[PDB]
Amino acid sequence: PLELTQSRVQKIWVPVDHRPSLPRSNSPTVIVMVGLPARGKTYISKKLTRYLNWIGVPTKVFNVGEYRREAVKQYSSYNFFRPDNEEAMKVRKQCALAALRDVKSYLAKEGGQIAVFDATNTTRERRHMILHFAKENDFKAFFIESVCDDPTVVASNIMEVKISSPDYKDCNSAEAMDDFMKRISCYEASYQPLDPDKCDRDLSLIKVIDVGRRFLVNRVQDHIQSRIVYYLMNIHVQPRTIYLCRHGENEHNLQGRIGGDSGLSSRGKKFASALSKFVEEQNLKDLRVWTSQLKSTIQTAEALRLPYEQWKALNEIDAGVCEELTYEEIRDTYPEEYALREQDKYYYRYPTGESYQDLVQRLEPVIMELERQENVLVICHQAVLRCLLAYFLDKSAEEMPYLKCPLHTVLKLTPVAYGCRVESIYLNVESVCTHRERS
Amino acid sequence: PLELTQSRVQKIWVPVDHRPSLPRSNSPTVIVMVGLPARGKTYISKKLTRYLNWIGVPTKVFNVGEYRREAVKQYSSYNFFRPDNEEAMKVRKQCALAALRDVKSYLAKEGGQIAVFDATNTTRERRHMILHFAKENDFKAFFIESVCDDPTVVASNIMEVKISSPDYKDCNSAEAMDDFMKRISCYEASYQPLDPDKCDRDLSLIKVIDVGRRFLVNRVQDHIQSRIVYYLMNIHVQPRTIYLCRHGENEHNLQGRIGGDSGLSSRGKKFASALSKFVEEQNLKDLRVWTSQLKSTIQTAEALRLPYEQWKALNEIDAGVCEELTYEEIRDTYPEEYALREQDKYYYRYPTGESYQDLVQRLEPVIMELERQENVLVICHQAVLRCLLAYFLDKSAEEMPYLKCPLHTVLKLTPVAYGCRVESIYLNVESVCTHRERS
Numbered sequence: 049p050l051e052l053t054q055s056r057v058q059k060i061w062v063p064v065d066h067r068p069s070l071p072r073s074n075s076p077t078v079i080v081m082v083g084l085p086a087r088g089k090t091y092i093s094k095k096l097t098r099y100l101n102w103i104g105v106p107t108k109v110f111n112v113g114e115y116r117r118e119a120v121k122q123y124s125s126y127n128f129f130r131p132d133n134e135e136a137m138k139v140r141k142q143c144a145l146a147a148l149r150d151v152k153s154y155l156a157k158e159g160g161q162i163a164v165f166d167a168t169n170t171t172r173e174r175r176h177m178i179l180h181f182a183k184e185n186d187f188k189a190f191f192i193e194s195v196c197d198d199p200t201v202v203a204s205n206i207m208e209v210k211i212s213s214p215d216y217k218d219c220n221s222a223e224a225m226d227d228f229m230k231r232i233s234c235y236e237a238s239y240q241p242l243d244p245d246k247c248d249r250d251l252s253l254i255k256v257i258d259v260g261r262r263f264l265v266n267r268v269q270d271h272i273q274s275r276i277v278y279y280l281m282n283i284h285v286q287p288r289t290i291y292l293c294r295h296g297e298n299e300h301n302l303q304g305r306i307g308g309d310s311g312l313s314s315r316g317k318k319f320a321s322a323l324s325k326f327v328e329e330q331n332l333k334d335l336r337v338w339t340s341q342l343k344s345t346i347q348t349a350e351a352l353r354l355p356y357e358q359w360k361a362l363n364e365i366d367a368g369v370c371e372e373l374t375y376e377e378i379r380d381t382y383p384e385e386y387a388l389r390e391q392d393k394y395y396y397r398y399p400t401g402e403s404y405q406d407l408v409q410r411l412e413p414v415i416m417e418l419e420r421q422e423n424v425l426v427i428c429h430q431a432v433l434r435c436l437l438a439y440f441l442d443k444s445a446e447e448m449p450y451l452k453c454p455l456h457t458v459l460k461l462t463p464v465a466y467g468c469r470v471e472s473i474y475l476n477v478e479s480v481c482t483h484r485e486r487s
Numbered sequence: 488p489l490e491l492t493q494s495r496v497q498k499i500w501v502p503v504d505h506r507p508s509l510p511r512s513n514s515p516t517v518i519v520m521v522g523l524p525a526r527g528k529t530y531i532s533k534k535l536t537r538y539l540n541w542i543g544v545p546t547k548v549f550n551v552g553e554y555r556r557e558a559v560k561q562y563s564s565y566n567f568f569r570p571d572n573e574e575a576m577k578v579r580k581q582c583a584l585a586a587l588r589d590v591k592s593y594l595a596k597e598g599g600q601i602a603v604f605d606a607t608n609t610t611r612e613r614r615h616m617i618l619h620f621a622k623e624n625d626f627k628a629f630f631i632e633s634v635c636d637d638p639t640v641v642a643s644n645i646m647e648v649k650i651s652s653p654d655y656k657d658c659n660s661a662e663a664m665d666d667f668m669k670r671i672s673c674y675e676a677s678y679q680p681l682d683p684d685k686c687d688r689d690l691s692l693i694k695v696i697d698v699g700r701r702f703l704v705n706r707v708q709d710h711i712q713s714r715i716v717y718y719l720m721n722i723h724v725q726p727r728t729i730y731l732c733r734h735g736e737n738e739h740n741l742q743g744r745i746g747g748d749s750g751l752s753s754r755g756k757k758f759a760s761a762l763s764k765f766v767e768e769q770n771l772k773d774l775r776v777w778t779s780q781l782k783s784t785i786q787t788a789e790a791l792r793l794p795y796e797q798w799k800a801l802n803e804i805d806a807g808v809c810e811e812l813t814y815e816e817i818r819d820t821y822p823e824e825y826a827l828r829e830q831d832k833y834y835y836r837y838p839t840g841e842s843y844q845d846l847v848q849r850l851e852p853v854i855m856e857l858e859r860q861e862n863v864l865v866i867c868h869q870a871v872l873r874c875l876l877a878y879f880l881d882k883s884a885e886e887m888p889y890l891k892c893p894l895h896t897v898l899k900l901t902p903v904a905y906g907c908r909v910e911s912i913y914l915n916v917e918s919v920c921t922h923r924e925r926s
């Protein structure tokens with residue numbers, strides 16, 4: 049016995065399945081957002097979902113407000129949110145129940161692992177109902193409460209993403225701000241914060257206090273909750289810029305060879321000088337510079353005359369047996385391998401090498417550190433850059449291997465609202481094109 | 488410009504240092520343990536130090552009680568700890584100040600990065616003094632308080648590691664327990680828990696409540712504090728067993744070839760059957776089985792008839808250009824490389840390959856998951872096993888590449904007191920010997 053076969057795309061050893069003539073073919077989690085409006089619940093929901101999906105955990109946000117915008121006509125005022133508004137209170141409950149119905153369908157019938165229930169969930173009654181829903185559907189419940197009553201932070205959220213909401217199209221900036229403040233007040237009487245000391249002692253929760261200055265963590269049940277908690281503790285909303293680029297053109301680039309540890313070409317050295325001038329012109333307070341352990345990124349960083357840190361995790365995707373070969377030589381020596389990759393570029397593993405899937409797992413610590421840091425310049429490689437960019441730009445596993453990241457071009461990332469503003473800066477130095485479109 | 492050279496041992500690209508005829512040649516942290524006696528402060532101190540050293544952060548514990556045992560004669564009773572004991576109170580303060588003096592010498596003059604100050608530090612006055620010491624020496628201060636008043640947990644700590652203390656050699660189990668309870672009571676009046684709400688609002692701290700059921704986290708300043716917090720949140724004291732072994736003997740083992748993805752030899756298949764019988768005889772509640780993505784570990788797990796999980800992080804050390812070669816062929820084709828490895832086995836990086844140092848970084852997520860889990864069987868490879876074992880057995884980077892991990896032998900790890908009890912179980916199946924002693 050013990051007969052195994054290696055799967056063609058992913059290169060995984062599986063038992064040879066000599067299936068007879070008639071062949072036969074862990075618990076999901078509901079993340080409950082808790083808190084008054086303008087407490088960054090949607091910011092947390094979106095960011096956490098972006099991270100979880102990128103690491104390979106299927107996650108989806110269910111925002112009760114969007115179910116409400118669908119059911120109700122155009123928004124008039126805070127009067128809709130009044131506790132004495134009998135009709136709207138019924139509508140709002142129906143919307144929450146409709147979102148939960150879609151949560152059940154996502155987790156039990158669509159292969160989803162995490163459902164982020166993005167609502168106020170400010171009352172114990174609403175949360176008791178969510179817990180009942182979770183228990184009878186065999187879903188785990190994990191609560192994330194954001195507590196911040198700083199008026200500057202509240203006003204900043206209203207100004208950055210609330211006033212621009214479809215609800216406030218007919219309102220001006222000042223009356224949307226005034227309406228939203230009244231809207232928050234509608235929730236303040238009934239608001240029962242999480243109490244892990246007495247009432248919510250058995251609940252799995254995190255209390256994010258004053259934009260992540262302090263945390264109350266109670267009863268973390270599993271791996272995924274522990275990961276979420278770690279992530280929430282590393283992220284921040286301080287202003288910053290992320291610059292991402294590849295090493296300057298190398299000798300392998302000129303020969304159309306993949307992988308290797310070749311040095312900068314004459315043009316690559318020219319880009320490196322151009323990059324130093326660019327960096328200088330950005331006039332950044334304290335820039336952290338990260339490179340791979342491969343020569344071409346280190347030579348590029350050397351031109352900056354700035355301290356830099358080499359990460360083995362930033363090294364280009366390992367092509368295994370195909371290292372230092374041209375794509376023509378890959379097609380002619382390994383035709384089966386070439387066609388398999390073309391068909392499934394994300395999951396395809398090179399023989400004795402890696403997949404984009406392996407890269408994501410390697411780059412997880414890079415992402416966690418990028419979150420912690422304020423200004424960073426990452427000098428890396430084509431496949432590495434695509435992964436990092438897919439995380440920041442919320443791109444799927446399927447689109448990730450095809451993202452355009454040309455040589456001698458800086459990608460300037462500015463975190464704004466619920467994403468990244470991406471600015472491209474070509475440093476006017478010629479190079480070959482290493483981008484290959486799908487077939 | 489941009490001229491680099493690759494360092495012989497570690498394979499790091501560095502600027503060619505054309506040093507002239509006259510060549511010229513981040514803040515440490517004091518971790519402050521806080522809490523009454525028998526609160527697992529020494530358990531936390533030792534475990535955290537073991538983890539931090541293993542990941543490459545030089546860490547040392549400074550236990551004030553050991554400075555006291557050195558200054559004072561043999562221990563008589565709790566009377567030494569009385570608040571009205573003027574003389575012993577002076578001695579105890581002197582001991583704390585002597586430990587801090589050694590903290591300063593470790594962090595500022597010995598290249599240490601983290602000093603774990605293991606004492607009660609129960610008063611605000613003592614903590615104010617530690618903060619003053621940290622501020623004037625330019626050290627960061629991070630507080631770890633353990634709060635647990637459960638009498639079962641307190642009694643268990645006294646029974647497991649207190650009664651066996653050199654202090655209680657002349658006392659019997661019952662009178663050591665009675666003396667220790669009186670000793671704790673000496674500290675209870677003056678005890679001022681950390682107050683991150685009002686008084687300790689500006690301090691960087693973690694409050695570990697009821698053996699890690701709940702956590703209060705305030706003002707995490709840097710990377711290392713964030714890592715510590717994550718680690719404390721993943722560890723537990725629930726009873727469990729860790730079984731570690733290599734895959735059954737493979738075809739490359741028979742040929743004396745390194746690396747590769749060869750399958751089990753006839754003896755390797757025999758071990759796999761023997762392992763299944765062994766596993767069955769252990770009568771474990773719920774065993775998690777982990778393998779690498781290499782065929783030989785998967786074939787071994789296949790014999791168990793148990794579900795298993797494949798980790799790419801458990802794949803054997805990458806030998807780069809030396810993969811699938813015998814050691815004789817390495818010495819004859821790459822003599823410089825062979826001698827360099829022999830001289831510096833931990834830091835040595837194989838060309839286009841890895842070092843034991845790279846393995847530790849890869850295995851960090853494995854260690855974190857091993858901590859979270861209760862019963863686990865890890866079927867892996869020689870170098871991978873040495874790293875994991877060095878973490879559990881608190882072995883240095885220098886000794887790690889030489890740890891004996893023979894084939895067809897299970898290493899049964901039982902966490903007891905402040906370490907691991909290691910039991911070896913040879914499953915009576917012959918194999919070749921792949922262990923190579925130093926030169």
Ligand SMILES: COc1ccc(-n2cc(-c3ccccc3)c3c(=O)[nH]cnc32)cc1
Pocket residue numbers: 086087088089091092194195196201202204205208209256258259260280283284285464465466
């Ligand atoms: C761009 O629009 C934003 C709107 C809101 C936020 N935000 C993010 C947090 C926040 C919460 C926990 C961790 C990190 C940030 C937060 C808050 O605690 N209170 C109000 N607002 C908040 C950020 C951008």
Ligand SMILES: COc1ccc(-n2cc(-c3ccccc3)c3c(=O)[nH]cnc32)cc1
Pocket residue numbers: 525526527528530531633634635640641643644647648695697698699719722723724903904905
């Ligand atoms: C083997 O001797 C031990 C002595 C003490 C412990 N211990 C560990 C913790 C503990 C604390 C935080 C996280 C994990 C464990 C703890 C405690 O909160 N209160 C009393 N004791 C304790 C374990 C073994």
Ligand SMILES: O=P(O)(O)OC[C@H]1O[C@](O)(CO)[C@@H](O)[C@@H]1O
Pocket residue numbers: 305306307364365367429430431449482484
């Ligand atoms: O992105 P692709 O086409 O999958 O391949 C990535 C390749 O691109 C390069 O960065 C250069 O073309 C190589 O280092 C790497 O092998």
Ligand SMILES: O=P(O)(O)OC[C@H]1O[C@](O)(CO)[C@@H](O)[C@@H]1O
Pocket residue numbers: 744745746803804806868869870888921923
């Ligand atoms: O432990 P060493 O002697 O440094 O080398 C590790 C080698 O041992 C093996 O496990 C077998 O000898 C190989 O897979 C690996 O290359």
